[PDB]
Every structure is written in structure tokens, then in C-alpha cells.
């Protein structure tokens with residue numbers, strides 16, 4: 467048991483700096499997700515993440531916190547249960563998302579990243595595994611999770627942007643990291659959106675060119691810097707190359723034009739003649755016997 471109304475269960479995976487568990491609400495009977503961090507770690511970070519989660523509450527696509535406290539030898543946070551990550555669905559769709567599905571996700575993922583920025587934070591871990599779909603009536607709503615690597619980019623009181631600086635502690639997934647990260651440059655808002663661009667091309671292509679190579683981080687960096695966007699996005703609509711170029715060229719402290727980025731794909735969504743039924747690839751899978 468955990469807290470007051472939550473029972474513990476399976477270990478379902480590992481988040482950034484912690485372990486994730488299935489939980490069952492005793493009062494309402496609903497299922498929940500629980501994060502546990504051992505107390506005696508010399509670098510405790512669960513409480514920091516929880517406060518960020520609390521700051522994000524009320525926004526679209528932010529998981530609702532049910533409880534957060536201490537039990538036994540663990541700090542504990544309780545989230546509403548959500549659906550599979552975009553990586554899970556990507557594998558279920560044979561690692562191939564249709565252009566319509568990619569654009570549908572892109573619109574929401576940009577707004578999730580914008581909302582976090584609107585709360586003075588940068589995610590710094592933008593990857594498919596950190597986007598989870600909702601459940602039930604929210605089955606078409608993309609959530610954003612795992613604020614363990616998040617970091618304030620402007621002062622809450624004055625909005626003063628953090629200074630341009632060297633940050634060589636490579637933090638985040640290498641495959642989707644911004645080139646600025648590889649060059650040991652402090653991440654800013656442009657870096658979250660640049661990482662998202664690599665995610666979108668990941669969905670389009672099925673694998674990024676710098677896949678399957680401390681040593682590997684340098685190799686990924688070299689291939690990322692040796693890959694022109696024209697080569698990376700060859701065969702796909704120009705908006706993806708336009709999106710990446712806009713994020714890469716964005717100034718360090720500049721506020722991104724989120725609306726322009728979303729409209730890039732929305733206009734392409736309309737021009738391609740796609741229905742807005744909000745039907746994803748995984749809603750079209752067929753099933754049967756073995």
C-alpha cells in the first residue's frame with residue numbers, strides 16, 4: 467500500500483531517475499501510475515520533478531497528480547494512468563506512421579512543448595517515449611511526461627532568459643538531441659522543438675540515419691552534423707525541412723513562433739486532403755487468428 471488510497475503493484479518501467487509502478491486507487495477503484503525513488507540516493511530529484519508537475523497542472527495534456535509524498539524508503543508520486551507512448555504505438559504500427567498520423571501528432575506535440583515553455587521550463591528530453599496517449603474519452607489527446615531533465619529557461623518574476631552558456635553535461639536521449647546539446651551548448655526553447663523535428667522524421671522514416679552506430683554519443687553527433695536536412699527529409703513534404711531549419715536557426719533566447727510552426731503542418735494537412743476525424747494509424751490495425 468502507498469499513501470492513503472493507493473495500493474502498489476508491478477514495476478512497469480523506468481523513468482528518468484526513478485522506477486514506475488502500477489497502482490490501484492482503493493476509493494474510486496480506478497488504476498493509477500506510481501513513481502518511486504529511493505530516499506537515500508545522494509542525488510534526490512523526485513521532489514523537484516513533482517513541483518514541476520504541479521506547476522504544469524491544469525494544462526492540456528499534462529497528467530493529473532493524484533498524490534505525492536513519502537513511504538518507507540521511497541519518495542512517491544501518483545499519476546493518473548495514461549495509454550501507451552508514441553514509441554509503443556510506433557512499434558505496434560510496424561515502425562511506420564502515415565503522413566496523416568504524423569501531422570496529427572505534430573500539432574499536439576508542438577502545443578505541449580509550447581505550454582511547458584509558457585511555464586518557464588524546457589523539457590530537454592523530447593522523445594517518443596515521453597509522449598503518452600490518453601485513455602477513454604482522451605484517447606486522442608497526446609500527453610507529455612518525464613520532467614526529470616527539465617530546467618528553467620527564464621526567471622518567473624522577470625522572464626529574463628538564461629544567459630548563453632556552455633553546458634557539456636549531455637542530458638537527454640542522444641538520438642533526438644539537438645545539435646546544440648552535442649556541441650555542449652545550454653539548451654533553450656529552440657532545442658525542444660528541434661528535437662521534436664527529429665522525432666517527426668523518425669516517425670516518417672522509421673529510423674533516423676544516425677541510429678545503430680560515450681563513444682556512440684560522438685558518432686551520433688558526427689553523423690547528425692554530416693546530415694543535411696535536404697538529405698534527411700528527402701522524399702517527404704518540404705514543411706518538415708522548413709520546420710527543422712526554423713528551429714536550428716532560431717536565436718538562443720528567441721521565443722519560437724509556435725503558431726507558424728503548427729500552421730506549417732496544418733496547411734499541409736489541408737492541402738493533402740486529409741480528413742480531420744482524429745483517426746490514427748493504430749485505429750486502423752486489423753486482427754484475427756494466428
Ligand SMILES: CC1(C)Cn2nc(-c3ccc(F)cn3)c(-c3ccnc4[nH]ncc34)c2CO1
Pocket residue numbers: 478479480481482486499500501529543544545546547548549551595611612
Ligand atoms: C516508463 C516511462 C518511460 C516513464 N514514465 N514515467 C511515468 C510516470 C508515472 C507516474 C509519475 F508520477 C510520473 N511519471 C509514466 C507513466 C506511465 C503510465 N501512466 C502514466 N501517467 N502519468 C505518467 C505515467 C511513464 C511511462 O513511460
